[PDB]
Design an enzyme around this catalytic site. Structure first.
Site, PDB file in Angstrom:
ATOM      1  CE  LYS A   1      -0.494  -0.514   4.825  1.00  0.00           C
ATOM      2  NZ  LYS A   1      -0.801  -1.433   5.891  1.00  0.00           N
TER       3      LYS A   1
ATOM      4  CE1 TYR B   1      14.429  32.267   4.482  1.00  0.00           C
ATOM      5  CE2 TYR B   1      14.543  30.002   3.668  1.00  0.00           C
ATOM      6  CZ  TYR B   1      14.371  31.366   3.432  1.00  0.00           C
ATOM      7  OH  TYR B   1      14.172  31.879   2.175  1.00  0.00           O
TER       8      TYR B   1
END
Lengths: 356, 337
Positions: free
Chosen positions: A34, A254
Site C-alpha cells: 500500500k 532561516y
C-alpha cells in the site's frame, strides 16, 4: 541538473522477503505494498516481491495499478470496499475483500454468487481493542457463521495495535484472537505484521502480512535493521551545491537557529522539505558523506539544507546520503520525532527515482 | 472508491496575488512556484497566477515544466544552474539565472554572447549573513562591476533569514544590501519574500518574490491568514469510512501514506461542515480516528483535514512544524481535483 535521487535496491527487497519466509516458514505471505509500496514505487517493487503469495493494498485503485502493471497475484483489499460499485470490479480483477462492518457485509452477500465463483476468500476483520476497523466479539462470530453457511471461505483477520513494544493490550488481543479462532474453527487465520513475524511465530497461522520489514526498515524502536538482519531498500541522495567558510559567532539558515562556536566549513546540499526531507528535528540529525556522518546545521528549507563539513573532505558535486545503508532511515526518523514508515511515505515527486 | 481529495481554489490564488499588488504596488512580482507550486500543482496554479510578471523555480526541470504547460512568462532559476550543460537550455528557454558562486559566474561568462542576446538578466545573489548561498561583500561588487562591463543587465538579489520576526540580522542584511546597491547603482534589485512584502515596502524595489502568501498560508508563526487577509488555497479532505460507539468515533480515509502528518505535540483537529472535531489516538498509514460525539455525521461524510475552516498553519503547529512543510509533503495517493 539538480541532483536529488531515490534509489530502490531490488535484491534487498528479495532478501527481506526471504527473511519473512525464514521467520514464518509454513505461512503464505501477503506482502503489504500500500501507499505506492510504502513510497518505494510499485513499478520498482512488485517484480522483486513476485514470490509473494498475495499483495495487500489499502484500496481498489492500488489494486488496479498492480493489475495494470501486469501482475496476476492474488490482491487483498485490506480495508475492503468503500462503495458498493467497487464490488463488480473487485470480483472481476480477483481482489479478495476484507469486510469490517455491516455495510460491507450486506454488499458482499448481495454479490455472493460471482464472488464465490471467482474463488475469492473473504477476510473478516476483528476489532479486538484497537477500535479502528472491525467487528467486535461476539458479533464477528455470527458474521463468520453466516458467511460460511452462505458458501464463503473465510479468513479471520486481526491487526495488533502495539506489537512493536511490550504492552498489555498485546495479550488481550492474542487471547481475543485465539478465542475467536477456536470458536470459528475450522478457519483460516492471519494476524502477524512485521513486528509479530519477529516476536510471535506461534501466531503465524495461514497468512502473515509483512510490510515495513520488506523495505529494510525496523518495526521496533529498540532494534536496528542490522539487529534484525534486514537490508535497507531505499537510498535517498542529493549533492553539495555550495561551500562556505564561516567565522565564530556567524549564524546559519532561516531562523538563525545555529551559531558557529568556532570557525567552520559549511556545505549546502540540494535537498529540502520540498523533496520530502523532513524539516523539524527534536535532536541533532546527520547525513552520510565519504564514510562519515556530518551534522545538519540550522533550519531545513524547502530546497536546501546546510551541513557541517569541517571534518570531512568534500567538493562541489559530492554525493550526500540522507538515508540508506550508512545513515539509517529509522535514525533520521527518531531525530525528526517520528517513525521510518512516515519518512518513506512522504517524499515528493521532485526526486528522480532509479531502480537498482 | 476510497476518497482522499486535494482541491485548489483558483479564485483564492488570484485574491492573494492581488494582495501582493496591494502591498507592493510598484514592483514586478516573481511568483514562487517551486516544488510543484508549494504542493498545490503547477498545472492548477500557473493559470490562476497568470498575471505574474515572472515565475520563480528551484531548478531547470521545474522551469521546463512551466514551458511544457504553455506558460511563456520569464522564469528565474533561483539557485541558478547546477551543471554547465544546463546553460544552453536556460538560454533557449529564456530562463534567467541566479549566480551565487564562482563556478556559476565562470559558466555564465563562457555563454555571455548568447545569454545577453537572448535579453536575459543575471540575478547576482548576496550572502549577507543567512549563510546559505551567495557572494559576500566585497567580493560581490567585483562580480557585478565585471558583469556590467561585459554588457549584462544585473539584478541584485538577497533573501532574508528572519523576515518573519523581529531580529537584528534583518537590519544587518538590509544595510549590507543597500550599501552594495549604492556602490553598484543603477542596478535592479530584489529582496522581499512574503514576510518582507508584509513588513517592508521600502525594500520592494523592482522585483518582489511572494511564495507562501500566494497559497494562503502564513509566513508568520504568530499571525493567521485572517489577520493577514489571505485566502487559503488548498482544501485537503477525506471521508468517514466507519463509525463506532465506544464516545462516538469516526474513522476517516486519510493517513501519513496520503501526506497527513503523523506526529503531534498537541491536540489536533479536523473540521466537519465547519465544526472542529478532535483527532484521537495515533495517525496510521491509511486512517485516522476522530471524535464525533457532538456532531451529527454519516458514513461518507466529507471531513476537512485543512482548508478554510481548519487552517493548515494550525495543523502544522500541532505537528511541530510550519504550513509550508505540510503543503509540500502530500503523497500521490489523494486525487487532485
Amino acid at each position: 541538473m539538480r541532483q536529488a535521487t531515490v534509489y530502490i535496491d531490488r535484491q534487498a527487497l528479495q532478501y527481506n522477503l526471504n527473511r519473512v519466509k525464514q521467520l514464518a516458514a509454513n505461512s503464505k505471505i501477503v506482502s503489504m505494498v500500500k501507499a505506492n509500496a510504502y513510497g518505494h514505487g510499485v513499478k520498482d517493487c512488485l517484480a522483486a516481491l513476485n514470490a509473494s503469495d498475495a499483495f495487500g493494498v489499502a484500496c481498489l485503485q492500488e489494486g488496479l495499478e498492480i493489475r495494470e502493471l501486469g501482475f496476476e497475484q492474488p490482491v487483498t483489499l485490506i480495508e475492503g470496499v468503500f462503495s458498493e460499485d467497487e464490488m463488480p470490479v473487485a470480483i472481476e480483477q480477483k481482489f479478495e475483500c476484507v469486510i469490517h462492518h455491516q455495510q460491507q457485509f450486506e454488499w458482499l452477500i448481495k454479490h455472493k454468487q460471482a464472488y464465490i465463483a471467482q474463488g475469492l476468500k473473504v477476510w473478516v476483520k476483528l476489532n479486538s481493542g484497537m477500535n479502528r476497523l472491525g467487528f467486535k466479539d461476539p458479533e464477528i462470530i455470527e458474521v463468520i457463521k453466516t458467511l460460511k453457511s452462505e458458501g464463503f471461505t473465510c479468513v479471520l483477520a486481526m491487526h495488533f495495535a502495539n506489537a512493536d513494544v511490550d504492552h498489555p493490550l498485546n495479550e488481550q488481543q492474542k487471547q481475543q484472537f485465539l478465542h475467536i479462532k477456536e470458536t470459528c474453527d475450522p478457519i483460516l487465520a492471519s494476524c502477524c505484521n512485521s513486528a509479530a513475524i519477529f516476536k510471535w511465530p506461534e501466531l503465524n497461522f495461514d497468512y502473515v502480512r509483512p510490510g515495513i520489514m520488506l523495505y529494510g526498515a525496523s518495526p521496533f524502536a529498540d532494534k536496528t535493521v542490522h539487529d534484525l538482519d534486514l537490508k535497507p531498500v531505499m537510498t535517498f541522495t542529493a549533492e553539495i551545491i555550495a561551500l562556505n567558510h564561516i567565522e565564530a559567532g556567524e549564524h546559519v539558515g532561516y531562523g538563525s537557529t545555529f551559531c558557529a562556536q568556532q570557525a567552520m566549513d559549511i556545505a549546502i546540499v540540494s535537498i529540502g522539505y520540498g523533496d520530502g526531507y523532513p524539516r523539524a528535528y527534536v535532536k541533532q540529525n546527520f547525513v552520510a558523506i565519504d564514510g562519515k556522518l556530518c551534522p545538519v546545521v540550522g533550519r531545513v528549507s524547502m530546497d536546501m539544507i546546510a551541513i557541517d563539513v569541517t571534518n570531512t573532505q568534500v567538493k562541489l558535486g559530492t554525493q550526500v546520503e540522507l538515508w540508506g545503508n550508512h545513515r539509517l532511515v529509522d535514525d533520521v526518523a527518531e531525530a525528526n520525532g517520528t517513525i521510518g514508515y512516515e519518512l518513506l511515505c512522504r517524499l515528493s515527486s521532485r526526486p528522480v527515482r532509479q531502480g537498482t
